Each structure stands twice: as structure tokens, then as C-alpha cells.
């Protein structure tokens, strides 16, 4: 009968892969079976992965996610006992796009911009960046985009005033986590063609309002 594989050891091989290896038990193991699952699920619902060598690469994993796993050998007598558990967390990767940009337009020159958190954060989001710029009718920039800097970049809304009347602008929003900046959500809008609705702004410090012609 085979003993348990020894020194089970796992290391992230990326944001969607883990490398798990162990020492062959003495005897004549024919192969190994690995059980692995997301932290918070269960061994009873484990994924089951066969290997003919004393290592495996776990694939199609979630980014920034803890996985638990263990491994047994099988041989002439069937499966031996499993190794002790190991836990390993995949790397972060950049977030997905923010949600579709929402514009609550106040006037011909003022709009609120807001967006939902990325559907996949793939890590811990530490900031958003909003850019905006004039475009012509083919979404071709007229001059450079402008980057907005704000006191709290984790906020998902911005007020923008002093936009040029009846001109289209491109707006973009992207999100950052520990892996870096993810892809941009873009929208092109002209306030002239939007429904107008009044806004109430509490008279308090640090309102995130951007002057578009400065
Ligand atoms: Cl990967």
C-alpha cells in the first residue's frame, strides 16, 4: 500500500493557474489524483485532476482567489491516503471595464458622470481614472484628452461643468488594482441631445466637480 505524497507545495503560476507538486511516496505509484476547490466551497465538490507525474498545473482559475488542494497516489492496491492540505492564492490581474457610463445631464454645459464597479475586479480596486476630450463626428479627438485627478479616486461619480455648448465629447473610465489599470469604458455624448434634469448639491467641502475648460 502507498503512503501519502509528502511535502505538498503550491505556488501561483499566474492569475488563472497554480503549480502544485509533491514528493512521490515510496513504492510504485502509477499516478496521482489531485482534489482542489475554491476556499469557501468544499472537498465534497472538489475538482478532480489526474496526473502521471508528481506535479500538476491547475487551470481556468479565478484571479485573486484562494484555492485548497491535496493529492493522493494510486497503485496496485488502489488509492492511498491524501496529503495534508495546502492553500494557495492566484495573482491579481487587471480589472474588467467599469460599468457602462451613466450621464445625468443638468444643462447644456453640466453633467454628472457615474459608473458601476467592474463586473470582475480581479483584485482590490484602488482607483478609477476619468478622461474626457472633444471629438468630431467620427470619434476623432480634437486636441488631447484630459485626465481628471481627484482627492478620492475610489468614488464612482464626477460632476463636470463648463463643457462647450453643443459639442460632442468622448469620456472614458478605467479601473486600477494591484495588477494595474484595466480596459476603458468609453462613451460619446453631446449634452444638447440629452434630457435635462435639475440636481441638488449639498454645500459641503471637496465636492468632486471638474471645470472642463481649465
Ligand atoms: Cl495565468
UniProtKB/Swiss-Prot annotation:
Name the protein family. Answer: Belongs to the integrin beta chain family.
Q: How is it modified after translation?
A: Palmitoylated by DHHC3 at several cysteines of the membrane-proximal region, enhancing stability and cell surface expression. Palmitoylation also promotes secondary association with tertaspanins.
Query: Which gene is the coding source of this polypeptide chain?
Result: ITGB4
Write down the disease named in this UniProt entry: Epidermolysis bullosa, junctional 5A, intermediate: A form of epidermolysis bullosa, a genodermatosis characterized by recurrent blistering, fragility of the skin and mucosal epithelia, and erosions caused by minor mechanical trauma. JEB5A is an autosomal recessive, intermediate form in which blistering lesions occur between the epidermis and the dermis at the lamina lucida level of the basement membrane zone. Epidermolysis bullosa, junctional 5B, with pyloric atresia: A form of epidermolysis bullosa, a genodermatosis characterized by recurrent blistering, fragility of the skin and mucosal epithelia, and erosions caused by minor mechanical trauma. Junctional epidermolysis bullosa is characterized by blistering that occurs at the level of the lamina lucida in the skin basement membrane. JEB5B is an autosomal recessive, severe, frequently lethal form with variable involvement of skin, nails, mucosa, and with variable effects on the digestive system.
Instruction: Give start and end of each Fibronectin type-III domain.
Output: 4-93, 97-196
User: What is the recorded name of this protein?
Assistant: Integrin beta-4
Domain text from the record? The VWFA domain (or beta I domain) contains three cation-binding sites: the ligand-associated metal ion-binding site (LIMBS or SyMBS), the metal ion-dependent adhesion site (MIDAS), and the adjacent MIDAS site (ADMIDAS). This domain is also part of the ligand-binding site.
Tissues in which the protein is found: Integrin alpha-6/beta-4 is predominantly expressed by epithelia. Isoform beta-4D is also expressed in colon and placenta. Isoform beta-4E is also expressed in epidermis, lung, duodenum, heart, spleen and stomach.
Q: How does it assemble?
A: Heterodimer of an alpha and a beta subunit. Beta-4 associates with alpha-6. Interacts (via cytoplasmic region) with COL17A1 (via cytoplasmic region). Interacts (via cytoplasmic region) with DST isoform 3 (via N-terminus). Isoform beta-4a interacts (via cytoplasmic domain) with DST (via N-terminus). Interacts with RAC1. ITGA6:ITGB4 is found in a ternary complex with NRG1 and ERBB3. ITGA6:ITGB4 is found in a ternary complex with IGF1 and IGF1R. ITGA6:ITGB4 interacts with IGF2. Interacts with TMEM268; this interaction prevents ITGB4 degradation.
User: What functional role does this protein have?
Assistant: Integrin alpha-6/beta-4 is a receptor for laminin. Plays a critical structural role in the hemidesmosome of epithelial cells. Is required for the regulation of keratinocyte polarity and motility. ITGA6:ITGB4 binds to NRG1 (via EGF domain) and this binding is essential for NRG1-ERBB signaling. ITGA6:ITGB4 binds to IGF1 and this binding is essential for IGF1 signaling. ITGA6:ITGB4 binds to IGF2 and this binding is essential for IGF2 signaling.
* Residue span relative to the full protein: 1126 to 1339 of 1822
Domain of life, per lineage? Eukaryota
Q: Where found in the cell?
A: Cell membrane; Cell junction, Hemidesmosome
